[PDB]
Each structure stands twice: as structure tokens, then as C-alpha cells.
Amino acid sequence: GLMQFTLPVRLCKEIELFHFDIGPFENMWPGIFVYMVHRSCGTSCFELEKLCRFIMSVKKNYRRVPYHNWKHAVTVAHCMYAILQNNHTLFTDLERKGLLIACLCHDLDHRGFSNSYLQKFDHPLAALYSTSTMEQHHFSQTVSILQLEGHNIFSTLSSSEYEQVLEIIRKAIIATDLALYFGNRKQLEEMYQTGSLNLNNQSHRDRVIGLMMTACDLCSVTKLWPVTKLTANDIYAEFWAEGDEMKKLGIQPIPMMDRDKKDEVPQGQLGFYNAVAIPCYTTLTQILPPTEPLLKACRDNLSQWEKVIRGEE
Numbered sequence: 024g025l026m027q028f029t030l031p032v033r034l035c036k037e038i039e040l041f042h043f044d045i046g047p048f049e050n051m052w053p054g055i056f057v058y059m060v061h062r063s064c065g066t067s068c069f070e071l072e073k074l075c076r077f078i079m080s081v082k083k084n085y086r087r088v089p090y091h092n093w094k095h096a097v098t099v100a101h102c103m104y105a106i107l108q109n110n111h112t113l114f115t116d117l118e119r120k121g122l123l124i125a126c127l128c129h130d131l132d133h134r135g136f137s138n139s140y141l142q143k144f145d146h147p148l149a150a151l152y153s154t155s156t157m158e159q160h161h162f163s164q165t166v167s168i169l170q171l172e173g174h175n176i177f178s179t180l181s182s183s184e185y186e187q188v189l190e191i192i193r194k195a196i197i198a199t200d201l202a203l204y205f206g207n208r209k210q211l212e213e214m215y216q217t218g219s220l221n222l223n224n225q226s227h228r229d230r231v232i233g234l235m236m237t238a239c240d241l242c243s244v245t246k247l248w249p250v251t252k253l254t255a256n257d258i259y260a261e262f263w264a265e266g267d268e269m270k271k272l273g274i275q276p277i278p279m280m281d282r283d284k285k286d287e288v289p290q291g292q293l294g295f296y297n298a299v300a301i302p303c304y305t306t307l308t309q310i311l312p313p314t315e316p317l318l319k320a321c322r323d324n325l326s327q328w329e330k331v332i333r334g335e336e
């Protein structure tokens with residue numbers, strides 16, 4: 024009850040910044056997450072014994088893939104933490120509770136393969152879930168872990184509060200399907216510009232939380248250049264493995280996933296920052312001004328990929 028988590032001074036200061044890197048010591052990531060929940064939500068949001076048991080069951084259900092692993096989960100939750108802390112007053116007690124859990128859980132039991140490869144392989148998950156295949160699986164795994172004995176971190180919530188939080192988590196996780204991001208951001212663009220955007224309209228909040236989820240999920244592009252550069256290697260290691268598997272089924276993979284097109288990575292990153300990342304952090308900064316550092320950091324890394332193309336590294 025009187026048991027604060029405290030981090031070493033450098034982490035205690037740096038964890039408050041958008042560009043924080045959680046570092047290579049796996050054994051500190053649970054503590055970092057609890058620290059974030061305590062400061063973001065209160066020390067009485069979850070029973071500590073239940074939270075720790077939940078964190079360790081979630082960790083166990085992430086797999087040893089190059090990118091979509093336990094480190095990604097805690098990284099996406101840290102970015103959500105920075106957004107919530109820099110926008111104190113705009114979020115309900117239930118949203119604060121739900122969204123950090125959503126981020127930790129948003130890629131549960133990921134195998135390193137796109138929804139596309141599941142559908143072309145004809146994986147059972149593609150028959151159970153026609154769209155946002157992995158994302159419906161991720162939510163389904165979250166509910167499973169929540170239903171293990173000793174794991175209901177929401178046990179103190181009322182019946183209707185519980186249903187509200189599981190519904191926040193469900194939409195949050197569905198929204199991490201990047202196929203859905205384009206239309207979601209387009210609608211938010213128009214709603215902001217025509218002045219119709221209304222944070223009391225629950226369907227408008229949903230969209231805004233959806234954009235935050237995309238922003239947190241892509242936050243590797245908002246880190247210090249050496250972090251961004253080295254994460255890109257993990258991202259392509261999965262993509263190229265998938266491309267290999269596409270070829271195994273007798274299919275030319277998209278260039279993104281073809282390891283023969285290694286040499287064109289810098290140009291593919293350009294496309295990605297221009298088509299996806301910059302639009303994402305732009306629209307988020309307009310709706311939530313204190314998230315500007317994510318846009319600024321994104322632009323800095325775009326400029327670093329331009330330098331790679333021009334032979335300056």
C-alpha cells in the first residue's frame with residue numbers, strides 16, 4: 024500500500040520524455056511498466072499482486088520474434104504513458120487504466136507474420152477472423168489472460184465499468200491494424216478542420232484513441248537516430264522472413280518483404296515516413312498539441328534517412 028516503485032535517477036527523469044528507450048535489461052521492463060501505471064493512474068488502480076501476475080502472464084504470451092516481442096509491448100505502453108502524462112485532464116479514470124493495458128497486450132501471441140500472410144497461408148485464425156486477423160487474436164488473448172485465476176486486475180470495477188474498459192481495450196487493439204489507420208486519420212483530419220471534432224462524442228473519442236494507438240505503435244520512428252536505425256533492422260528481419268515464406272507458397276512478395284531489395288531500404292523508409300508516420304504525428308499534434316515532440320522527432324529521423332540516401336551515412 025505504501026510501496027512506491029522508483030527507478031534510478033537517469034530513468035526516473037528520461038522515462039517522462041517521448042524518446043525514452045527502455046534499454047536492454049529485460050528484467051527491468053515489468054518494474055518500468057508498474058512505475059508508469061502508478062504515476063499515470065494511481066498506486067490503487069490495480070492490486071499489486073494481481074498486476075505483477077498479469078504482467079508476467081502477458082510477457083510469457085509474447086514470442087521470441089525479432090520485432091513484435093515483449094520489448095515492443097513495453098515500448099508502445101511507454102509512448103502511451105508519455106501521451107497520457109502530457110494531456111493530464113483530457114482522459115477518464117477508465118481510459119487511463121485501459122489504454123496502458125491495451126498497449127502492453129496489443130500484439131499478444133504475434134508470430135512475426137502480417138494478416139496478409141495468414142490469409143494466403145490459410146491459417147485457421149484467417150477463417151475465425153476475416154479482417155484485422157491478428158488484432159482480433161490479440162484482444163482474444165488479452166481476455167484469456169484476464170480470466171486466469173488471480174489475474175483479474177479489473178476485479179474492483181463495477182459490472183458496467185468492467186464492460187466499458189474491455190470495450191476501450193478492444194477498440195484500442197483493433198485500431199493497431201494499420202489498414203484501418205488511413206480512413207481513421209482522414210476522418211479526424213476533416214472533423215478537426217471543419218470544427219466538428221467533439222471530445223464528448225464517444226465515437227469521436229474512439230477515433231482519437233485509435234490515432235494515439237497508431238502513434239504509440241509506430242513510436243520507433245520518434246526515437247534517437249541510433250534506436251530508430253537499429254529497430255528498422257528488426258522490422259525488416261520479420262518482413263524478409265515473411266517474404267521468404269510468401270516465395271515458399273509460390274508468390275512474389277511485395278518489395279517491402281523482399282530481402283533482394285535490401286539496397287532500397289532508405290527509399291522505403293522515406294515512403295513510410297511520408298505516407299504513414301508524418302501524417303499520423305501531424306494529425307495527432309493538431310488534436311493533442313503537447314504530443315508535438317513525436318512529430319518533431321519523426322521529422323528528424325526522416326531527415327536522417329534522406330542523409331543515408333545522399334551518401335552522408
Ligand SMILES: Cc1nc(C)n2nc(CCc3nc(N4CCCC4)nn3C)nc2c1Cl
Nearest residue numbers: 241243244278279284287288291292294295
Ligand atoms: C515503425 C514502423 N512500422 C512499420 C509497419 N514499418 N514498415 C516499414 C517498411 C517501409 C517500406 N520499406 C519498403 N521497401 C521497399 C524496398 C526496400 C524497403 N517499402 N516500404 C513501404 N517500416 C516501418 C516502421 Cl519504421
Ligand SMILES: [Mg+2]
Nearest residue numbers: 129130157199
Ligand atoms: Mg500488431
Ligand SMILES: [Zn+2]
Nearest residue numbers: 129130199240
Ligand atoms: Zn505493435
